[PDB]
């Protein structure tokens, strides 16, 4: 409900070109993100991070973009302990988008340590279609950043895929 | 088959083999036209995902335009079959290439379809999809400068 109203501000702000509506929506969305982080709401966090990225993609808000990189690190953490393959896949995929758009080396190195666990989550779940996505995500991680222990992990996983 | 085309794109992207990705591009251009003939829209979305992946590394303009061409064909089949989950994927993907390449043709195709595509989401009652679909309409009307579309997404936004 609080998220539905924030979405009502982003949609109207991105329509009328109201730079003040996006400034208020991004500030409320940054605060709302820290709220659902303590509640463990993964489903609503997927929509909040989707709205945050959509705002920063249009107005170039590096502040809201950097804040999204921090909460996506914590939101991806909750998905891994919850063994949620579909949420961990969307979370890590969007994390690469923020890693590529913002050039954050911290979020890139964080993906290097978790890609071994997200891919194993897809292998443990048996979803080969969802695995091919995560295996491709591991290739993009080793391509953009110097991955010494990840490049040999995704390579061996492709043969067994 | 997409299952082996997947194996070539992943191996070429990982080892940097430009000839390997080139070989997948010829197979993708032939597999996409066949996937549209069969009507497999779930598999075509995977081939489209692979097509825009090899093109955004090898710098392919012919295959990317071919992927943008079968997107317009797959969107019509998704509209004739009321496949809301597909039509939302084809349209949202069409905006991806139209934004990075500035293709005025792909943007103009999206103005006429976003009306019938949004109406497909409101008819099914999927409130979680039309909100994504409405956002697709704003970028269509804002980035392409559409006057008749700006009033359409606004009128649908007030009814939310």
């Amino acid at each position: 409900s609080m998220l539905e109203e924030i979405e009502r501000l982003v949609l109207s702000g991105l329509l009328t070109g109201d730079k003040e509506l996006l400034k208020k929506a991004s500030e409320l969305l940054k605060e709302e993100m820290e709220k659902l982080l303590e509640e463990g709401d993964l489903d609503a966090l997927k929509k909040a991070l989707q709205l945050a990225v959509n705002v920063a993609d249009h107005n170039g808000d590096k502040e809201l973009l950097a804040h999204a990189a921090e909460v996506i690190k914590r939101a991806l953490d909750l998905a891994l302990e919850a063994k949620d393959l579909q949420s961990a896949k969307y979370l890590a995929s969007l994390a690469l988008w923020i890693a590529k758009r913002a050039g954050d080396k911290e979020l890139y190195a964080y993906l290097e340590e978790k890609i071994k666990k997200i891919i194993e989550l897809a292998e443990e779940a048996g979803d080969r279609e969802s695995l091919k996505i995560l295996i491709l995500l591991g290739i993009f991680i080793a391509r953009d950043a110097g991955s010494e222990e990840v490049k040999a992990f995704v390579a061996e996983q492709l043969e067994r895929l | 088959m997409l299952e082996e085309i997947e194996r070539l794109v992943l191996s070429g992207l990982l080892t940097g083999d430009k000839e390997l990705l080139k070989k997948a591009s010829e197979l993708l251009k032939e597999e996409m036209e066949k996937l549209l003939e069969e009507g497999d829209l779930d598999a075509l979305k995977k081939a489209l995902q692979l097509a825009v992946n090899v093109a955004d590394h090898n710098g392919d303009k012919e295959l990317l335009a071919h992927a943008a061409e079968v997107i317009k064909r797959a969107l019509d089949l998704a509209l004739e079959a009321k496949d809301l989950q597909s039509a939302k994927y084809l349209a949202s993907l069409a905006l991806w290439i139209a934004k990075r390449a500035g293709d005025k043709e792909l943007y103009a195709y999206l103005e006429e379809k976003i009306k019938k595509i949004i109406e497909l989401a409101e008819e099914a009652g999927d409130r979680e999809s039309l909100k994504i679909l409405i956002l697709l309409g704003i970028f269509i009307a804002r980035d392409a400068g559409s006057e008749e579309v700006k009033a359409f997404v606004a009128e649908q936004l007030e009814r939310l």
Binding site: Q50, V53, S93, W97, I133 | Q49, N53, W96
Partner: peptide, 8 residues
């Protein structure tokens, strides 16, 4: 997704 959706 790798890439497409709004975004994902």
């Amino acid at each position: 997704x790798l890439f497409x959706x709004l975004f994902x």
